[PDB]
Design a protein around this ligand. Structure first.
Ligand SMILES: Nc1ncnc2c1ncn2[C@@H]1O[C@@H]2COP(=O)(O)O[C@H]2[C@H]1O
Lengths: 127, 128
């Protein structure tokens, strides 16, 4: 009758980094534990090498990311806004407020991320 | 019980200029009209004389501004980035990224602004 969310096995310390990264993000410090637990179980791993463009400002959004290793640079209109380290969320705006990517994310080093797709996250709001 | 956002009574003209500034921001046009209203109500007035620096690059962010009157010039690392007048929103970037101000805003003539602070600004974005 109702949808089933994909489940991705994780190390307990991965699980811990994701959660805490979520609590750290301004626009998600309002989520119920139950809901954060559902997010944590739903992210999947993705790696990018250095000099990689993950998010292009203007394109549409479908993935929200938590960074486990590495360091990324954020730019809007060729302007360096800031850099981001592990334990930080990003690419959340276009998923929450259904807009287009507000800036571009390039990698500086190799990075390992967690990512959750459009569909899954929506469902986790219906709580 | 949740928190209670402050109310700032406003001239209809102003309540409308602000709605304009917001709808013209290249990110905030995507907000629900309710959220836009809640914002409008939470803005409050600030005045600056000319040759004054409102936002300094590298600083911690706290306030988003809308501009009612005046001209301001946005810069960075010494370089100019654009003139700017009434109806525009600025200072959204540092809030949208829990990072630091990315530019330096200075007046050019006497200016008048509306300002929402970041706690209000985010409390509003957590809806519906
Ligand atoms: N290249 C640019 N063109 C126009 N406005 C800008 C530019 N860069 C920054 N700003 C504005 O200037 C503000 C300076 O502080 P913020 O980064 O918080 O938000 C910024 C934007 O509102």
């Amino acid at each position: 009758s109702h949808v089933t969310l994909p489940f991705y096995p994780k190390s307990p310390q991965s699980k811990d980094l994701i959660k805490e990264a979520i609590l750290d993000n301004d626009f998600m410090k309002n989520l119920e534990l139950s809901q954060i637990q559902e997010i944590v179980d739903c992210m999947y791993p993705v790696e990018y090498g250095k000099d990689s463009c993950i998010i292009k400002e203007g394109d549409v959004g479908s993935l929200v990311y938590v960074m486990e290793d590495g360091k990324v640079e954020v730019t809007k209109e060729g302007v360096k806004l800031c850099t981001m380290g592990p334990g930080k969320v990003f690419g959340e705006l276009a998923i929450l407020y259904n807009c287009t990517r507000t800036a571009t994310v390039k990698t500086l080093v190799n990075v390992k991320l967690w990512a959750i797709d459009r569909q899954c996250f929506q469902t986790i709001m219906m709580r």
